[PDB]
Design a protein around this ligand. Sequence first.
Ligand SMILES: O=C(Cc1ccc(Cl)cc1)Nc1ncccn1
Length: 460
Amino acid sequence: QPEPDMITIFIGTWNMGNAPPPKKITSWFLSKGQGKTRDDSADYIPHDIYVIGTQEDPLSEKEWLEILKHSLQEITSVTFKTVAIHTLWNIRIVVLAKPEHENRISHICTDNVKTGIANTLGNKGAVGVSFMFNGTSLGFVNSHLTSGSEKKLRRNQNYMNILRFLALGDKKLSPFNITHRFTHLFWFGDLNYRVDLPTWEAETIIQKIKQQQYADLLSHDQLLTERREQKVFLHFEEEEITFAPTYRFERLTRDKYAYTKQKATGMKYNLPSWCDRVLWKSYPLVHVVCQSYGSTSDIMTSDHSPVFATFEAGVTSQFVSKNGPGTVDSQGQIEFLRCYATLKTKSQTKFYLEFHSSCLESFVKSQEGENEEGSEGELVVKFGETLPKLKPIISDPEYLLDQHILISIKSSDSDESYGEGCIALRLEATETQLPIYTPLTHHGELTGHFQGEIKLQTSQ
Ligand SMILES: O=C(Cc1ccc(Cl)cc1)Nc1ncccn1
């Protein structure tokens, strides 16, 4: 039975509004309703992995697991295995996988982050799950960010705290946050970004939604505008939104948006908004294709509609050779020519590089680079031809060309990372000098970039 080179992943996000679900929720797992929906011809085909994020979830873990498993069994006639479940307050993540994947899944991690301080600590934050699927690392984050149209900057802060402090994936990757630890990272939830239009336009917005004319609403969506201005979710992707705003509905119908200020809303307006979202970030040149992104029409117990997204994702096998793992394969090497880092820092410490990859026995520290003054004020750290030669555990190009090198540039004075990035070994040629490039981030903010040339030697 051969190992897969692709899997499908279902991502769900639903703010349940503290109400139990209706008896049937299969439309969610089938990607049926509005938006980019799944073909009917696929309905009996199980996804490999289902990741369910809920917010304002009133159910016990046991109660929700029974509903989810019984739902999937009705659709697929498959009894899914529970990979992980983690709950912070009323924010929950469940990962389910086909039984054939049980002995492909390992290194399961869960964590949570509580956002805010005092007043604003006690119900918002994030839960997450990571694991290895054969040779591929997968991370999943369900966040419930700060509410309210006027609090976009609080949401951006919540985002930075979650990606700094959520402790998932390989702890040996110590310079790297969750935005660099995984081959594929999915981040979803009630992100709570709103359509930033005047209150007086509520009925006009509703009109536009009834016409299925979303363009003038999406151009004011705070998440799209904050992402375009590089304020949040830098280097994440989102599929085009082609479904109606998923908040705020009158319960037990979808015919009415309930936007007016009420004591129950703290006298705040809730103009129709795309609160409920799915984004992802995959390592460079790894296959990832969104095959659905939409909302259900028939699940009406909450003031939010459920959102679904599905993906084709590239995966690799757990490779063994005569040599690695447990030794190097002298027929493999990775060389770096004409390399330099450009950093936004006002500091003047010496800097060195760390190279981290599961194709290495352990991470590799470089010598210090040579600082020059850049012509526009920036710091340029020159490595030239001085970077060490990396010795992969396996030389077979079927393995090595699928790998990635994580780079941290660190202060010699403090050993703190000033920037993190990632280089793909999926090159156009071997034994050939080729340009490489990554942006550098720290705490998920842009801090610089790393560029130079690579020369990769494989067994072929
Ligand atoms: O339970 C797991 C991890 C796992 C892996 C795959 C899946 Cl589909 C579900 C769970 N390991 C384990 N095994 C025996 C005793 C204790 N822990």
